[PDB]
Amino acid sequence: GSSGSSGRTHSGEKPYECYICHARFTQSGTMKMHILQKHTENVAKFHCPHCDTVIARKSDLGVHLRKQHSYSGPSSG
Protein backbone atom coordinates (compact mmCIF):
# COMPACT_ATOMS: atom_id res chain seq x y z
CA GLY A 1 0.00 0.00 0.00
CA SER A 2 1.72 3.13 -1.29
CA SER A 3 0.39 5.69 -3.77
CA GLY A 4 0.56 9.40 -4.52
CA SER A 5 -0.60 11.64 -7.36
CA SER A 6 -1.53 15.31 -7.76
CA GLY A 7 -3.74 17.03 -10.31
CA ARG A 8 -5.49 20.34 -9.64
CA THR A 9 -5.66 23.17 -12.18
CA HIS A 10 -7.94 26.21 -12.11
CA SER A 11 -7.47 29.60 -13.77
CA GLY A 12 -7.41 32.38 -11.19
CA GLU A 13 -5.34 32.65 -8.02
CA LYS A 14 -6.87 33.79 -4.73
CA PRO A 15 -5.20 33.25 -1.33
CA TYR A 16 -8.54 34.19 0.22
CA GLU A 17 -12.07 32.76 0.12
CA CYS A 18 -15.43 33.26 1.82
CA TYR A 19 -16.31 30.44 4.22
CA ILE A 20 -19.97 31.34 3.73
CA CYS A 21 -20.57 31.26 -0.03
CA HIS A 22 -17.16 29.93 -1.06
CA ALA A 23 -16.45 33.13 -2.99
CA ARG A 24 -12.72 33.28 -3.70
CA PHE A 25 -10.90 36.61 -3.36
CA THR A 26 -7.46 37.86 -4.39
CA GLN A 27 -7.63 40.62 -1.78
CA SER A 28 -7.83 40.21 1.99
CA GLY A 29 -9.79 43.45 2.21
CA THR A 30 -12.31 42.65 -0.52
CA MET A 31 -13.17 39.33 1.11
CA LYS A 32 -13.65 40.72 4.62
CA MET A 33 -15.81 43.46 3.10
CA HIS A 34 -17.74 40.82 1.15
CA ILE A 35 -18.57 38.76 4.24
CA LEU A 36 -19.86 41.91 5.95
CA GLN A 37 -21.62 43.08 2.78
CA LYS A 38 -23.39 39.86 1.79
CA HIS A 39 -23.32 38.15 5.18
CA THR A 40 -23.86 41.09 7.54
CA GLU A 41 -26.61 39.28 9.46
CA ASN A 42 -25.20 35.78 8.97
CA VAL A 43 -22.37 36.52 11.40
CA ALA A 44 -22.08 36.97 15.17
CA LYS A 45 -18.66 38.59 15.55
CA PHE A 46 -17.62 41.51 13.34
CA HIS A 47 -14.09 42.03 11.99
CA CYS A 48 -12.58 45.23 10.62
CA PRO A 49 -12.18 45.10 6.81
CA HIS A 50 -8.93 47.02 7.31
CA CYS A 51 -7.01 46.01 10.44
CA ASP A 52 -7.27 43.00 12.74
CA THR A 53 -9.77 44.10 15.38
CA VAL A 54 -12.94 42.62 16.89
CA ILE A 55 -16.23 44.52 16.65
CA ALA A 56 -19.28 43.87 18.82
CA ARG A 57 -21.92 44.45 16.14
CA LYS A 58 -22.24 46.09 12.72
CA SER A 59 -23.65 49.36 14.05
CA ASP A 60 -20.55 49.48 16.25
CA LEU A 61 -18.23 48.97 13.27
CA GLY A 62 -18.96 52.48 12.03
CA VAL A 63 -17.73 53.96 15.31
CA HIS A 64 -14.42 52.14 14.87
CA LEU A 65 -14.22 53.15 11.21
CA ARG A 66 -14.63 56.77 12.30
CA LYS A 67 -12.50 56.66 15.45
CA GLN A 68 -9.56 54.43 14.53
CA HIS A 69 -10.00 55.05 10.80
CA SER A 70 -11.39 57.97 8.79
CA TYR A 71 -14.81 57.14 7.34
CA SER A 72 -17.07 60.19 7.10
CA GLY A 73 -18.41 62.76 4.65
CA PRO A 74 -15.96 65.51 3.66
CA SER A 75 -17.62 68.45 5.40
CA SER A 76 -15.98 71.66 6.64
CA GLY A 77 -17.29 71.87 10.19
Note the residues at the interface with Zn ion (CB under 5 A).
18, 20-21, 23, 38, 48, 50-51, 53
Our CB check for Zn ion shows the closer of 9 and 51 to be 51
Three-state DSSP class for residue 43? coil
| C-beta of residue 12 within 8 angstroms of C-beta of residue 27 | no
Closer to Zn ion by CB, 70 or 74: give it: 70
Q: How far is the CB of 12 from Zn ion (least distance, A)?
A: 16
Cα–Cα distances (Å) from 66 to 11, 24, 32, 60, 73, in that order, read: 38, 28, 18, 10, 10
Q: How far is the CB of 71 from Zn ion (least distance, A)?
A: 10
